[PDB]
A paper describes a structure:
The function of the active-site metal is to activate the reactive water molecule involved in peptide hydrolysis. Actinonin is a natural product with antibiotic activity that inhibits PDF by mimicking the structure of its natural substrates (nascent peptide chains starting with Fo-Met-Aaa, where Fo is a formyl group and Aaa is any amino acid) in their transition state.
Compound 21 corresponds to another interesting derivative designed to probe the impact of the peptide bond in PDF binding. In addition to the hydroxamate group, this compound features both a hydrophobic benzyl group at P1' and a reverse peptide bond. After soaking with crystals of apo-AtPDF, compound 21 could be detected in high-resolution electron density maps. Unlike 6b, 21 did not bind the active site of the enzyme but an alternative pocket at the surface of the protein. A docking study performed with EcPDF had previously revealed this alternative binding pocket. Upon binding of 21, the 3D structure of both molecules of the asymmetric unit remain in an O conformation (r.m.s.d. <0.2 Å with respect to the apo-structures in the “O” state). Moreover, we noticed that the binding pocket of 21 was located on the rear side of the true S1' pocket and induced a weak modification of the P1' hosting platform.
Residue numbers in the entry: 1 to 181
The structure:
């Protein structure tokens, strides 16, 4: 497996609804949880492991044998709190890059579980922060999209280094450039 890095177009592509709730889905969910634990995460979205589907694995405790393993298939955020909070946010798709992002403090979510059954969940604090970050991934939205112009300016060169790395690895032009903003 791999974590897909910016500016790989997989991180922007449309993520497809999941219709099939079978053993293959269970196997993918297992693999994703295990990447999440390997990388000390609280949540992981399918596009970040190269699969453009509406799937997130999540454990609010973010540690083995703690919290709960929540599978969110086709999730939708139904409500965002009016209250906003800043947080020094990171992203595995942008290795070593951290910057301030302002987001709602809490959210309410509708999703389907591993069997396709509807459920809802409310999150606050760090779990809500991580969820929103990963939910953005499911909508092809990356964390610098959420930064102020001033904060973005502070990481532009780091993003350009990633753009160059992609061009060197693939022989293709970077499909997006932070310059465009
Ligand atoms: C920032 C605007 C476009 C006003 O609304 C959103 O993108 N809302 C976000 C929640 C949010 C994130 C960060 C700061 C403030 C609110 C929800 N959203 O993507 C709606 O399309
Ligand atoms: Zn691998
Ligand atoms: Zn496993
Ligand atoms: Zn596991
Ligand atoms: Zn940890
Ligand atoms: Zn992630
Ligand atoms: Zn991320
Ligand atoms: Zn939006
Ligand atoms: Zn430039």
């Amino acid at each position: 497996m791999e974590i897909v890095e910016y500016p790989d177009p997989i991180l922007r592509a449309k993520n497809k609804r999941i219709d099939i709730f079978d053993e293959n889905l269970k196997n993918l969910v297992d693999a994703m949880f295990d990447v999440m634990y390997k990388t000390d995460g609280i949540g992981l979205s399918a596009p970040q492991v190269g699969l453009n589907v509406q799937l997130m694995v999540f454990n609010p405790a973010g540690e083995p044998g703690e919290g709960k393993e929540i599978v969110l298939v086709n999730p939708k955020i139904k409500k965002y709190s009016d209250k906003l909070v800043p947080f020094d946010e990171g992203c595995l798709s942008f290795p070593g890059i951290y910057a301030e992002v302002v987001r709602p403090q809490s959210v309410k979510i509708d999703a389907r579980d591993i069997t396709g059954e509807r459920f809802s969940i409310s999150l606050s604090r760090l779990p809500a922060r991580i969820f929103q970050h990963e939910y953005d991934h499911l909508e092809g939205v990356l964390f610098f999209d959420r930064m102020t112009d001033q904060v973005l300016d502070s990481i532009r060169e780091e993003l350009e280094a990633l753009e160059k790395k992609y061009e060197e690895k693939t022989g293709l032009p970077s499909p997006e450039r932070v310059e465009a903003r």
